[PDB]
Amino acid sequence: TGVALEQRPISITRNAKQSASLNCKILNPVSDYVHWYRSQEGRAPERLLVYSRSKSESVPDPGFSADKVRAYKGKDDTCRLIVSDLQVSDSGVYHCASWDGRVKVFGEGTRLIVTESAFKKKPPKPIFFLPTSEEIKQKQSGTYICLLEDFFPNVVKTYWKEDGNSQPLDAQFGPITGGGNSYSQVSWLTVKEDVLRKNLTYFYQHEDLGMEPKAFSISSV
């Protein structure tokens, strides 16, 4: 049915000398090896280690110590990457990957953030704006707007679905704006009048929510 890898939560924030466990739920596996790549701004992405699920064996690539990075097994046939003794230089996006023939398939990645400053995680506070009559009158279409505010860290994932479909809709997303301990992001969905009667669901994920998305229903009623 096609190989696919899932990674949650979308970010992990830590102070120095702590550790971090990254999750990879691999579905329809076609291979025995789970690969862990790291991406950092301005550097070439590179593989850190490869893990054999069967032999339950974690093999680091040169430059990486098994004391520093190590993969093991988790609940529900999940591969997990532990990064010990975190330093700021460890921040970046960590992707699990799997070979599927001559093609390598990658998870979406979890962002590891290591900082030397005190921090507190803060969940998005959503604010919804609904289509206005004037917009429908002038454009025969209506825009749903969700503003997420005052979250930390500056990592968030949002998507719109309509009931009966499972492909995210083509929404517009603004940049993540802010600084210090408070970031925000607005997204919005412009749809034709026919779709204005259908039911929509809005989702977001954030590290302060753990793994489970928050979901809102938008309906006629």
Binding site: L5, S31, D32, Y33, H35, Y37, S39, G42, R43, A44, P45, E46, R47, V50, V59, D61, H95, A97, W99, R102, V103, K104, V105, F106, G107, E108, G109, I127, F128, F129, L130, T132, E134, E135, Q138, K139, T143, I145, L147, K157, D170, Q172, F173, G174, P175, T177, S184, Q185, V186, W188, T190
Partner: protein, 213 residues
């Protein structure tokens, strides 16, 4: 004693920049340090926030790609491989990486990547289009919705009886039709008079919710 191939995998991608939708992307990857003719080389798309995606790859006997509009090719006397993507759209933006498969030959093989090169796809120019402007409210939050303008440069301002309100901020994004739309957010009491004022190509557009006659 151990026996290993004497090689380093050096890959340098070029050709990135800002492209107009509909144009053809042509990238080059200059390789060095390993035996070129017998190698296996691929192109991967790393778009921030998405899964890295295989696009196409090749060796001396075969090539494949994810879509018809995507192809790759080789220049042997120069140790280069190329990427071509016709009919670029907004989804093709991201960081394009050349990759080499390295290892024993099995599922323990790794990809070695270069630094990549950044591609930004933007809408193709078309006739100037003035936006429409809509005010929307939820409690003490006011959104100013600005729909379908081209080109992207504009100036927005939310004001309550003439003075700038606090905590204004502007988000702008392309749409599928090749135009832009934008949302300007601010904070103001649900009963205050509010005006959203947009300047675009020297024309002024606005909506206001009055508090008095």
């Amino acid at each position: 004693l151990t026996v290993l191939p004497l090689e380093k995998t050096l890959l340098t991608e070029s050709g990135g920049g800002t492209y107009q939708a509909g144009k053809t992307l042509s990238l080059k990857c200059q390789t060095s340090g390993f035996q070129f003719k017998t190698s296996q080389l691929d192109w991967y798309l790393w778009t921030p926030g998405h899964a890295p995606l295989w696009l196409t790859g090749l060796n001396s006997s075969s090539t494949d790609a994810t879509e018809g509009r995507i192809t790759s090719s080789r220049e042997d006397n120069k140790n280069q491989i190329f990427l071509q993507i016709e009919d670029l759209g907004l989804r093709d933006s991201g960081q394009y990486h050349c990759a080499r498969r390295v290892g024993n030959g099995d599922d323990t093989d790794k990809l070695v990547f270069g630094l990549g090169t950044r591609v930004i796809v933007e809408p193709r120019p078309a006739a100037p289009l003035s936006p429409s402007v809509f005010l929307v409210r939820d409690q003490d939050a006011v959104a100013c919705l600005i729909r379908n303008f081209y080109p992207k440069e504009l100036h927005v301002s939310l004001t309550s009886s003439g003075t700038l309100i606090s905590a204004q901020s502007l988000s702008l994004a392309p749409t599928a039709s090749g135009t832009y739309s934008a949302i300007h957010i601010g904070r103001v009491g649900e009963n205050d008079a509010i005006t959203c004022s947009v300047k675009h190509l020297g024309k002024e557009i606005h909506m206001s919710h009055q508090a008095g006659s």
